[PDB]
Design a protein around this ligand. Structure first.
Ligand SMILES: COc1c(C)c2c(c(O)c1C/C=C(\C)Cn1cc(COC[C@H]3O[C@@H](n4cnc5c(N)ncnc54)[C@H](O)[C@@H]3O)nn1)C(=O)OC2
Ligand SMILES: COc1c(C)c2c(c(O)c1C/C=C(\C)Cn1cc(COC[C@H]3O[C@@H](n4cnc5c(N)ncnc54)[C@H](O)[C@@H]3O)nn1)C(=O)OC2
Ligand SMILES: COc1c(C)c2c(c(O)c1C/C=C(\C)Cn1cc(COC[C@H]3O[C@@H](n4cnc5c(N)ncnc54)[C@H](O)[C@@H]3O)nn1)C(=O)OC2
Ligand SMILES: COc1c(C)c2c(c(O)c1C/C=C(\C)Cn1cc(COC[C@H]3O[C@@H](n4cnc5c(N)ncnc54)[C@H](O)[C@@H]3O)nn1)C(=O)OC2
Ligand SMILES: O=c1[nH]cnc2c1ncn2[C@@H]1O[C@H](COP(=O)(O)O)[C@@H](O)[C@H]1O
Ligand SMILES: O=c1[nH]cnc2c1ncn2[C@@H]1O[C@H](COP(=O)(O)O)[C@@H](O)[C@H]1O
Ligand SMILES: O=c1[nH]cnc2c1ncn2[C@@H]1O[C@H](COP(=O)(O)O)[C@@H](O)[C@H]1O
Ligand SMILES: O=c1[nH]cnc2c1ncn2[C@@H]1O[C@H](COP(=O)(O)O)[C@@H](O)[C@H]1O
Ligand SMILES: [K+]
Ligand SMILES: [K+]
Ligand SMILES: [K+]
Ligand SMILES: [K+]
Lengths: 354, 354, 354, 354
């Protein structure tokens, strides 16, 4: 970062971090229309999805109903781990016996996490996600490496989360089959406020990709996505898939009863590091609610439609070509101009609410 | 773009995009006053307007009443294409038989669009606008080139929309008589959110102009304009005309009945890519309403008055000289200072509402 | 401006404009306390004020009561010109016969303005202000030069307004005794929106000063000031005095009756380019109201107290040394941190309202 | 500062100032977990705290109850000086006789301040804080140097406040045992608005540290902190401790009765430069209220928990290693993404309110 901002060390403030709202994809020469785009992409080294989307491993987003629906829509669910091992394993079996659908499951770090992992593999899980706030901790890299050693022939092992090139490189050397990027950008996340730590999500992807791409390891962009265009941006920055919590938490298939506050409909959505999920603790998430959004299938159709539009605009027949697209950086005025502006919206759009 | 923002490719984030609110025109030495300014400008290679303004080809902005009024005010209307071919053609005839006024009409891409185009030419249209979200698609360049080949002796052919230098260059090589710039900046547009694609409108004009100006092809700045000063900025960036939807949709001549909500008056205004206009679809516009603004003539007087003021300030006797003016880039504080600030407005101004 | 923002001309977007909220003064080594600071400064080549403040030539800010009070407080008023010549001249006499106080008066450009000017000189005015939106117009430079030729032995002649180095240089060569800077930053001004023209006020001062300082011509910073700290910033950027409209319009001495809306007290304040002041016109100002602020003397005490504080902080015993102080440029976060933040204000401060 | 912003002097606008919301800490390789972090740090050359936090010397933040509680929590209180000397001294004795707890006390500059200081030393104070708005004034450096000469064997002497490298260097040469950084960032402070003076707090720390670190003098980051992550940022920028007013003013131990406005609970909090504290004056602070936050111990637990999280993320076993961490600079979009976003919070978190 060139500009003088204090002190005598030019590396103290090491770069300028961008996130989704900071950039637009540039249109390019195209012989692609949304209809002819191919949205398939690698979830891991061995697993390719038809639709490059996976649901967050959260107790207000993914249990078996969500996992089943995501798989049928061409993506995948990652089953959360805030429940007894026998119950998480049973949910893996529920998905597996609905057509041999793909499914993943989260585990932590340690002895209990290891027992959880072995049970999940026994239940037939396809992907284990080592699900942590900071994968550059040595204990996490150990967990990833040992799982890959012991069961890596039977199962794919994802490691996360990271926000730097060096952390992505450490997970690759540990043997990760994919690397999940996102420290702090989650809609329900307070890590960046409470700890003061993280990196803006576009820059975090660009950096992780610089480590993972040359090693042939897919990057999963996790957190901070709010519009279908954000998915296109994350993939163009080099991710192969995107993980969604907020965008899916409001759907019929997410766990939770409908909340009916003041004429409107909502579903609860909460961080896994919130007090409520963990039950003095120092939480790194909040508890809240999102608008009810109806069937998962209709949300995914809108998201994939927006991604297909982006592929047509950028002349990308495949996700692999989308990953080569270019950005322009924009100002606050640019962002206001990008949204609808100076008009009163009178009708809801299925892919846009202010 | 010099500053490090992630990864190892300096061309990934290729430049900084500016739009109207990011810049001001610098005053210069002047022997021009608003009264003596000459606002005429090229719409196309062959067509010069007295006032460098054209109304959007939208079903809530331009049918024959709007086209007639815009022509009489010294500009032009582009008749929308969300209606049967015989009806669009009939409206062209309505305008033509009100004094031989100039008129344009939108067409799409394909066989039905081609039949539409031939009928419009037969009705006496002066300008065909190949009206698309992404003119850098090969199908659009083909449509432009074939129209120019078949009927280009009888009619001027405009192509759009683009947001890059390379896309403008492709339209010029395809034979466009003008190039329309604007991917996503429209007030009712969600393309930049839904697809994540576009470029801020001042930068988009500067880039398109770098391709079109040396080839002698006029650029039409389309979308994102909200104040008379925006028109001056778009022209100074090198456009020859500006296309307006939002600013004209509220006028008496725009299609639509007056809406009377809660003591106030409005007219409907909607994207042509909204669900409502297209009638599961994945829309790229919204449906809404804008304040009623009275007769078109009075709006155009205010817009041209603001443009004339800019010409006096920049010492520009003609639009061609305005296109040589300089900008200063501004911060959010600069923008707040540019608007009225720290005062409660007690009376409406005819050319300013907060 | 180094960063790529579109096109092939590096001078198209010629620099980055800053205004007051973009910068802070850096504290420095000091043997000055607010009590020992000397706030005197040149209004013009020949006229030094005890307090570097002058009231705007506006019909809601300065008639004779305001002019008298400003002079007694150690500054000066400039009498507005939206009234018959005999009446403006009479007000000059009212001030002159209240102790031989300093007074200025605005005039325009042309034959009627020239008659106005001669009458004002006859009435004993000390300063003529050629009061225009764009002093880089040739007609204005002619007016300034001819006044200085004809009556420049009897009276000081101020010219404005400008926002560029070249325009300030032209006024200096025309013979101006001071140069007034400010195109568009006024609180009631819409020029930057309606015409799209101007330059952020700190940059406008820095540029004008680069022309005026080496010629020994004082710069008057006109418009955009809202806090006592803004006065210190304008002077540190190199201005010698500041002109205030909004900050003084609410005082007892400003023309206007008190407005009592919904339990509170206000006074009308309006641009001289508003429809109301000019009485289809294309206005460049709005009509509004500001909070009532009580006696002028108490406002000026607060403003000078804040300026004296700045002088103590920067180690400036005199305004001439304050003009050598340094800035740091700040971000939106910096600006939020500069104001009170994260607290509910329960008591009014005499020099701060949110 | 490279970019052209006006005039011909590249040093006029000398750098870009950042504050807390402008930066995030980058995660790094770590063998630290929050539990194993060591939060101890130097308050002064001779005094090490277990927890790197000290309460502001304000009459709505620190009297003896607060000083006692802060010391027991592993930090320190600085007793305010808006009260008679015998009473401030008595409060020092109250703290000293509650277990020989550490305590500091503020003094001003001059003869009365000197008498106050001698009485405080006699009462057994551990730290004298020369408590001023501008320590680069020569009178302040004299006060610091004379105290260190006369009583510097018995007591540690802190000097502040500063916002520049040169001012920190002057205090070091004057003999300060620590340097307090912060000109204007306080939540109740208006200095930056009223005087227009200051520097954004991250840059102010980086600059002061460049002077103090090589001389082995600890820096106290004072003002502007609102979240536990801010404490981690201030320390990573090189401060050794942080001083808090706003974050502690709402606690049970802060002076003040509970205010019960409209169903909610608050405590008064006011600048020491506000009219109310000083009792025409020209104040540099405001009077207000903050939410009631319960026992001090629980607030400090949340703050230290967030700091420990940051240490785990950055791989810092000690504060000395945290001081070597790196930042990424972020945009407004980055800041929105850092907070919770696009969710309605339904439950209060103990370490986060919007
Ligand atoms: C046409 O109205 C606009 C305009 C003018 C703009 C936008 C927009 O979203 C819309 C709404 C979009 C539609 C109403 C849908 N539509 C219809 C057409 C007519 O031309 C269709 C042809 O345009 C090309 N095309 C149109 N969209 C794409 C895409 N997403 N990817 C690749 N090619 C695309 C393709 O060759 C196709 O055959 N273009 N967009 C916009 O973002 O900036 C300008
Ligand atoms: C005079 O009040 C201001 C002032 C001081 C400012 C502004 C403004 O809009 C106004 C309101 C504008 C008016 C009340 C209209 N007006 C009257 C005059 C008196 O001088 C008129 C002469 O000023 C020159 N002039 C004034 N405006 C222009 C222009 N737009 N283009 C070219 N020349 C212009 C021209 O030579 C003309 O003969 N200037 N503006 C402003 O934006 O920054 C400063
Ligand atoms: C003391 O509280 C603060 C503190 C800590 C800060 C600020 C502040 O406005 C205030 C409020 C200001 C006052 C309560 C007034 N005050 C009293 C003192 C005690 O020391 C007084 C001495 O401090 C020096 N000093 C204090 N202010 C100035 C100034 N504006 N210009 C030059 N010198 C100044 C000068 O030598 C003077 O003898 N400093 N400010 C601030 O902006 O950042 C830190
Ligand atoms: C797990 O959920 C997340 C995720 C995915 C993210 C975040 C987050 O705050 C949370 C909430 C945090 C928790 C629910 C707490 N938790 C539990 C785990 C499971 O793995 C624990 C292991 O992860 C490592 N670890 C986890 N947090 C830290 C830290 N602050 N410092 C050092 N190491 C840390 C450490 O080795 C530890 O043994 N990670 N965070 C986040 O900010 O970005 C991604
Ligand atoms: O409590 C937490 N604190 C921080 N991040 C969390 C927490 N719980 C889940 N996450 C992350 O936030 C992501 C969802 O982000 P969203 O799509 O923006 O709502 C998840 O996939 C996790 O990576
Ligand atoms: O639904 C749509 N989505 C995106 N852009 C549209 C749509 N309909 C019209 N437009 C564009 O928006 C322009 C009007 O923008 P406005 O002047 O900012 O309201 C039109 O001239 C078209 O280029
Ligand atoms: O109607 C107008 N349009 C633009 N600027 C104006 C108008 N009337 C007065 N001004 C300028 O605005 C200044 C006052 O700005 P303020 O102190 O920010 O309210 C005056 O001294 C004039 O330079
Ligand atoms: O009235 C004042 N004006 C300016 N700063 C003050 C005033 N009173 C206290 N301060 C500073 O503000 C700090 C507290 O800031 P806070 O933690 O952001 O609320 C104190 O420790 C002092 O350095
Ligand atoms: K838009
Ligand atoms: K303004
Ligand atoms: K402040
Ligand atoms: K967040």
């Amino acid at each position: 970062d060139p500009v003088p901002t204090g002190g005598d060390d030019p590396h103290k403030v090491a770069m300028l971090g961008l996130t989704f709202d900071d950039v637009l994809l540039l249109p390019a020469a195209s012989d692609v229309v949304p209809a002819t785009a191919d949205t398939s992409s690698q979830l891991t080294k061995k697993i390719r999805l038809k639709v490059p989307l996976v649901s967050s491993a959260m107790d207000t987003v993914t249990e078996s109903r969500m996992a089943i629906a995501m798989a049928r829509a061409g993506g995948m669910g990652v089953l959360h781990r805030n429940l007894p091992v026998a119950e998480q394993a049973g949910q893996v079996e529920m998905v597996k016996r609905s057509g041999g659908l793909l499914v993943g499951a989260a585990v932590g770090v340690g002895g209990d996490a290891w027992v959880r992992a072995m049970m999940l593999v026994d239940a037939g899980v396809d992907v284990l996600v080592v699900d942590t706030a900071h994968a550059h901790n040595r204990l996490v890299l150990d967990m990833v490496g040992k799982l890959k050693s012991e069961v890596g022939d039977r199962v794919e092992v994802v490691g996360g989360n990271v926000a730097t090139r060096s952390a992505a490189a450490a997970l690759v050397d540990a043997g990760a089959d994919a690397v999940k990027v996102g420290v702090g950008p989650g809609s329900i996340c307070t890590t960046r406020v409470v700890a003061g730590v993280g990196a803006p999500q576009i820059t975090a992807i660009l950096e992780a990709v610089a480590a993972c791409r040359p090693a042939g390891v897919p990057v999963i962009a996790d957190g901070g996505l709010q519009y279908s265009g954000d998915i296109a941006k994350a993939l163009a920055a080099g991710a192969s898939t995107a993980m969604l919590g907020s965008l899916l938490a409001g759907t019929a298939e997410a766990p939770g009863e409908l909340i009916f506050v003041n004429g409107k409909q909502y579903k609860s959505y909460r961080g896994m590091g919130s007090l409520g999920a963990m039950r003095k603790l120092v939480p790194e998430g909040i508890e809240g609610r999102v608008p009810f959004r109806g069937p998962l299938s209709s949300v995914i159709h809108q998201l994939t439609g927006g991604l297909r539009a982006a592929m047509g605009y950028t002349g990308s027949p495949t996700i692999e070509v989308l990953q080569q697209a270019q950005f322009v950086r924009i100002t606050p005025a640019g962002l206001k101009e990008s949204h609808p502006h100076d008009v009163a919206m009178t009708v809801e759009a299925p892919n846009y609410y202010a």
